[PDB]
Design a protein around this ligand. Structure first.
Ligand SMILES: CCN(CC)c1cccc(O)c1
Length: 171
């Protein structure tokens, strides 16, 4: 049975309880924490690609007011459907299952300035989502897992001084 489990869920839940924030820049910023998953129940012999995209959680944007995140207005038009291909793709199930899969090089940005970066809208909440694509498959089978522990608000600068402090502490 295919199981994709979140690594360092306790680390994520510490950010989530403050409301997690990720910096977006012109040139793209790496995530902290990095999304990491363990995989079991792939066909070790088969080849797969691993994809990561970011699903918009709400039909409104967010604002940090009086040390509280609150609904902050109507959403902007959905960000372009950007997909990041794990650099180990394509690869054997055995490869994906032998060690955690880390999305350490993915970069979040607020400008379509190329370079395999993911465009997000400032002050919108996103949920990371991993896709396993079997290669050479005439049915193009894909599996999708969402990671609710890893939800964050995209920000051009940290709003919550506790998040700024956690990011320095655990990084
Ligand atoms: C947040 C909990 N804490 C100790 C369990 C921790 C700190 C850093 C990395 C990590 O995987 C965990």
């Amino acid at each position: 049975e295919l199981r994709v489990g979140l690594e360092e869920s306790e680390l994520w839940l510490r950010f989530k309880e403050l409301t997690n924030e990720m910096i977006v820049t012109k040139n793209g910023r790496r995530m902290f924490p990095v999304l990491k998953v363990n995989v079991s129940g792939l066909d070790p012999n088969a080849m797969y690609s691993f994809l990561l995209d970011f699903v918009a959680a709400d039909n409104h944007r967010w604002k940090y007011v009086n040390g509280e995140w609150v609904p902050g207005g109507k959403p902007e038009p959905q960000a372009p459907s950007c997909v990041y291909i794990h650099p180990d793709s394509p690869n054997f199930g055995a490869h994906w299952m032998k060690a955690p899969v880390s999305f350490s090089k993915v970069k979040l940005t607020n400008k379509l300035n190329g370079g395999g970066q993911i465009m997000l809208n400032s002050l919108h909440k996103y949920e990371p989502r991993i896709h396993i694509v079997r290669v050479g498959d005439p049915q193009r089978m894909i599996t999708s897992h969402c990671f609710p522990e890893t939800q964050f608000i995209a920000v051009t600068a940290y709003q919550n001084e506790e998040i700024t402090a956690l990011k320095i502490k655990y990084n």
